[PDB]
């Protein structure tokens, strides 16, 4: 895939944007809209033909000095409206209704800064947030009930700074500052019961709070993949793609190659390192890669603004060459990237509050 640069925005606050997400829930025909979070500011943009980009909306947390560095899109299943969840240094989640132009929900309770937000692929109401408090919390945005907390005695011992649902939303692979990657299964019996009890709870008819599930023991854990801070994790189907300070995105798999992800035991202590993606000049941490919806291309940027796009449809992406898209006016550290649902457009953000648009072909 060949990409070309058609637009290069620059926000006025001149503060790093650590997050950008395309609205993958929009249908076909309605225009492409994405959100970039940085400083105390959340902005929405629209992508039009011939490189046209339009700044639609902007939200600011003018008090208490919030540093937004996460965003995630969802929809209201009852009323079909979009919703954008943002979180950052304060550890508070703000579900924003961009069509009514107001923050409709807050979720406080994370003991430290939140640096990743994920929405359940099969359930818009279920939201996952990792935080500096060494734990992952699964929130329900229909009823404001915290479904579960992922952490504790066998949870992460340091800042959880990434996680990802598997593509059917049956498990979460979490990575933290403890060089460890941990797997938590939602398809378990207790977690489905937790969702069901979260959907039928209302405080107005009971004197007890919602019984959140404390899940201290993950279904897998490994420190054999990376020797430094693992700052991003995505699911390449059943193979987990993991990224750390070492300049490589490592495609690994729990257990031996004979075992499958469904049958690995919590006590399994071996992994297969079946591939890695080589790049360079990305030593600094909290740089995140993001494959497109179809998981056929993988994008990442380095400290000098070189955007590495890999083709995951090749027979063996281990030896495959990258695209190393770059622009002479770039140079700031790319923070995060996002593809459109059709992946016809690729977007990126930098540490100098700039947004770069790349179009396939």
């Amino acid at each position: 895939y060949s990409f070309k640069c058609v637009n290069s925005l620059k926000e006025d606050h001149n503060q790093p944007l650590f997050g950008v997400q395309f609205n993958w829930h929009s249908k076909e025909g309605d225009p492409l809209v994405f959100a970039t979070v940085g400083s105390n500011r959340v902005t929405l943009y629209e992508c039009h033909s011939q490189g046209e980009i339009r700044l639609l909306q902007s939200y600011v947390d003018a008090d208490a000095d919030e540093n937004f560095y996460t965003c995630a899109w969802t929809y209201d299943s009852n009323t079909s409206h979009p919703l954008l969840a943002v979180a950052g240094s304060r550890g508070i989640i703000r579900i924003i209704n961009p069509i009514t132009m107001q923050c409709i929900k807050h979720y406080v309770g994370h003991g430290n800064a939140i640096n990743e937000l994920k929405f359940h692929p099969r359930d818009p109401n279920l939201l996952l947030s990792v935080s500096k408090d060494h734990a992952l919390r699964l929130w329900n945005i229909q009823t404001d009930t915290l479904v579960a907390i992922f952490g504790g005695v066998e949870g992460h011992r340091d800042e959880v700074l990434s996680a990802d649902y598997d593509l059917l939303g049956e498990k979460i692979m979490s990575c933290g500052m403890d060089h460890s990657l941990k797997l938590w299964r939602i398809n378990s019996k207790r977690m489905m019961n937790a969702i069901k009890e979260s959907y039928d709870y209302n405080p107005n008819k009971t004197n007890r709070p919602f019984i959140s599930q404390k899940i201290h023991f993950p279904d897998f854990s490994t420190r054999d993949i990376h020797r430094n801070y693992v700052d991003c994790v995505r699911w390449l189907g059943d193979l987990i793609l993991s990224k750390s300070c070492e300049n490589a995105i490592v495609c690994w798999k729990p257990g031996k190659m004979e075992d499958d992800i469904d049958k690995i035991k919590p006590s399994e202590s071996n992994v297969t390192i079946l591939g890695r993606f080589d790049y360079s000049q990305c030593d600094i941490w909290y740089m995140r890669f993001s494959m497109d919806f179809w998981q056929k291309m993988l994008a990442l940027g380095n400290q000098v603004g070189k955007l590495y796009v890999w083709d995951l449809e090749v027979e063996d992406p281990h030896k495959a060459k990258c695209t190393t898209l770059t622009h002479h006016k770039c140079g700031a550290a790319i923070r995060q990237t996002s593809f459109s649902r059709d992946s016809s457009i690729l977007i990126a953000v930098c540490d100098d509050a700039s947004i770069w648009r790349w179009d396939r072909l």
Binding site: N228, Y229, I284, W285, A333, D351
Partner: peptide, 6 residues
């Protein structure tokens, strides 16, 4: 390892 920024 550390140094989130450049």
């Amino acid at each position: 390892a550390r140094t989130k920024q450049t």
